[PDB]
Design a protein around this ligand. Structure first.
Ligand code: HEM
Ligand code: HEM
Ligand code: 59W
Ligand code: 59W
Ligand code: H4B
Ligand code: H4B
Ligand code: ZN
Lengths: 411, 407
């Protein structure tokens, strides 16, 4: 079977066969599309097929399908599963696996980069202090004094689900949020609940607008422990504008390293619940979402005030005007400080080239349009005009519940 | 079976049950989402008729009344005898309002119950269609104080006697290829513009020539007509800050009037049902003006603003985009032609969703189309989960007539 996608701007038509290898469900049916819904302990029984499918994929990728090495590995994994109820990946399979989870991540516009990922194997880690050390090394490596390098650190896999490794932070580097008695918020309102947990755990909060949060780290199902990332490891960029000299006086900054730490990595049926990964920013993530969402820093008004835009009617488009200015500021600031960043034009244009190459070499590229299209200037990026097919391939990154919701506290 | 949608900005959770009434297919499966694909007998008719009549009689609080059971038997006799049936005027109006109400891709649905329905089922010729259409254009335009309207031509019978408007919209601009390799006017309309030429239209060959109507009655060959220019309200585009903007020579028309869709009510098919509302500014400023395959004006505008066009990261495209859209809204407002900005329209749609959830149990919505083509996340719809499903009565796409028509 063959499915076609059309770019309505170029008339380029692509043919997808890769979707045939998808088994996991989308949330949609013949009667309902759930394409805009954000969120739509394995037996031995279910494990061996998952391992077999993965190893078949791995051995095919290295051009050794059906080889003696391939067959011996299947047998070895089979034996290990029946005897121990799980199995261990070879370093080569882990690296392949992690890269492919990124390749398969339908919500990621940056996947042109997928084959360049530094994988840190942290499966020998046993304690929270051990995790802290691994994470510091990742942050220093990935940061590279502003010449950002993509990286992932992989902690031990789930065993019985009672001994999970988890990074409780949603990202390795994020700013604290504090709810004031008067109902206003200081700092990042997205991080209020998490900030509150850190405080309870014993963090001494500076109570400012951009306090880098401590790491809250859980090894082997134990209660999580707090650690402060050395400040010299946390690269930050003060935000200024190339023409507007008052922009610096907004007192804005952001961190250079975007590093997702709350997702679950699935490889061959194995579950890695702590697998922090990092790339580099696309400008709109900060300038559009972090700064201008109503439920985030919410700076549109203050910026438009300072620009002296007509604010009495939405139809002056003051908000759109201030939006572009803030996003120019973000890109200018990062580039001036030599911290890697990509603008949404460049990133989407690269994504289209990647997607086309993937169709040609792989038979497809699963992509979630709702997430791929940037949150400003949608239709002046080429992805807006690109039909996309969204389906789930493994290896994969998945959401998992917040750990404060599920953790059994030991004391 | 009961489905929740969350707004991530407000935490408001709504519960959808209306989807369970849905019947037609989405294009998606459990294995694949097709959310971003643009185009994903007497025996058949009686169930469709019944489903419709049932919802009509329920809507007037007469479900299962003697009047309800009388109508179902009368329609059933009519289908049994004629293989089709005729809608009462009340049914037709209800059907048309509900097709709009059900249009998952339309952000302007807060207005759905204020629709003027022009019954043109007595029409027989292209001159007659032309008359109905001029009357629709003049009524809807209302000297710039636009009113929503639909004109409904006779329903499909055996399918070789279709009424069709060949135009995609009642009012559009011509497109011309030259030796240049370039396109003058609207590249979207090149093929149609050429069909007009081959059928006899003498073209001014300019950038903004209002196209003629090409009208097909009763499956006959279509005929050309020029809409009286005094009936076509157009707006010159100027900027409230940039005096040079006027010299780009830009204008647009005031009346958005889709004329190529098919209205289905109670299984009956209305292949010619032009309808019109009023513009959201982005349709013109972002899409018509800035799509690479449309007027594609970003380069010329950026140049007049003297921006640094050497690198994408200066956001010269994005700056110019905003200015073009400011000009569109300013021009329509100044000339007193109804228009809505994307902020106002999307705020209205959120309120409409809330009304629909509370009063109807849901609102089918296609997020990919509802979120505006600029500044997505600063509009509330970006943060609103939506469920997309097909309800009837409906507006549907149909084949372009030129590919289908037997000459
Ligand atoms: C190299 C530069 C990269 C860029 C510019 C980039 C860009 C993005 C953006 C803009 C998003 C959507 C974020 C949001 O709106 O919340 C995203 C999502 C995502 N990316 Fe990337 N990415 C990069 C590298 C990576 C890497 C290294 C990985 C993992 C190895 C990754 C995996 C993912 C995943 C799993 C998502 C989904 C996150 C979610 O659903 O919350 N990306 N990417
Ligand atoms: C009153 C003001 C209205 C506004 C502001 C409005 C807004 C819009 C917009 C922005 C679109 C997307 C157009 C595109 O991107 O191609 C759309 C699509 C649509 N609207 Fe409306 N609308 C209005 C009135 C109407 C009326 C009166 C009807 C029918 C009675 C209608 C039915 C539809 C349908 C069926 C579509 C999908 C068209 C397609 O798929 O090409 N709308 N609407
Ligand atoms: N440029 C890069 C590189 C790597 C990773 C990234 C994503 C990061 C950065 N900027 C946002 C964050 O992405 C992680 C947060 N994404 C939303 C998670 C979420 C919330 C609610 C519901 C739901 F389904 C999902 N960007
Ligand atoms: N404001 C209003 C009021 C009523 C109606 C409208 C839509 C009109 C105006 N502005 C665009 C036009 O909409 C009709 C064209 N829509 C896209 C048609 C299309 C083409 C290719 C593939 C595909 F799937 C669909 N706006
Ligand atoms: C409701 C809707 O699906 C939700 O707001 C999505 C839309 N698209 C997105 N796209 C990206 N990249 N990131 C997001 O957080 C979202 N949010
Ligand atoms: C491929 C993609 O579905 C296509 O470009 C869509 C996206 N969203 C849209 N949204 C609206 N309102 N109108 C459109 O024409 C489109 N085009
Ligand atoms: Zn879907």
């Amino acid at each position: 079977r063959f499915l076609k996608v059309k770019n309505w701007e170029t008339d380029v038509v692509l043919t997808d066969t890769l979707h045939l290898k998808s088994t996991l469900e989308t949330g949609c049916t013949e009667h309902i599309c759930m394409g805009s819904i954000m969120l739509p302990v394995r037996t031995k029984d279910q494990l061996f097929p998952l391992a077999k499918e993965f190893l078949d994929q791995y051995y095919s990728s290295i051009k050794r399908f059906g080889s003696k090495a391939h067959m011996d590995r299947l047998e070895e994994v089979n034996k290990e599963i029946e005897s121990t109820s799980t199995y261990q990946l070879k370093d080569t399979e882990l690296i392949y696996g992690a890269k492919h989870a990124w390749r398969n991540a339908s919500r990621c516009v940056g996947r042109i980069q997928w084959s360049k990922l530094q994988v840190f194997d942290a499966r020998d880690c046993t304690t929270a202090h051990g995790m802290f050390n691994y994470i510091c090394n990742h942050v220093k490596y990935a940061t590279n004094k502003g010449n950002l390098r993509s990286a992932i650190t992989i902690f031990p896999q789930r065993t019985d689900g009672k001994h999970d490794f988890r990074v409780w932070n949603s990202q390795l580097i994020r700013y604290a949020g504090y709810k004031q008695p008067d109902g206003s918020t200081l700092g990042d309102p997205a991080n209020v609940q998490f900030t509150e947990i850190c405080i309870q755990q014993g963090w001494k909060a500076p109570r400012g607008r951009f306090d880098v949060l401590p790491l809250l780290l859980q090894a082997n199902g134990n209660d999580p422990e707090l650690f402060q990332i050395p400040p010299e490891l946390v690269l930050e960029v003060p935000i200024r504008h190339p023409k507007f000299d008052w922009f610096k006086d907004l007192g804005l900054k952001w961190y250079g390293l975007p590093a997702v730490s709350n997702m679950l990595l699935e490889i061959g049926g194995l579950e890695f619940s702590a697998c922090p990964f990092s790339g580099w920013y696309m400008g709109t993530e900060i300038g559009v979402r972090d700064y201008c969402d109503n439920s985030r820093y919410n700076i549109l008004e203050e910026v438009a005030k300072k620009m002296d835009l007509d604010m009495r009617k939405t139809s002056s488009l003051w908000k759109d005007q201030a939006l572009v200015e803030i996003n120019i500021a973000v890109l200018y600031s990062f580039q001036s400080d030599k911290v890697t960043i990509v603008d949404h034009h460049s990133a989407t244009e690269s994504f289209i080239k990647h997607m086309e190459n993937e169709y040609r070499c792989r038979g497809g590229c699963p992509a979630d349009w709702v997430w791929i299209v940037p949150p400003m200037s949608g239709s002046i990026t080429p992805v807006f005009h690109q039909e996309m097919l969204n389906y789930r391939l493994t290896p994969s990154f998945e959401y998992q519940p917040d750990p404060w919701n599920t953790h059994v506290w030991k004391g």
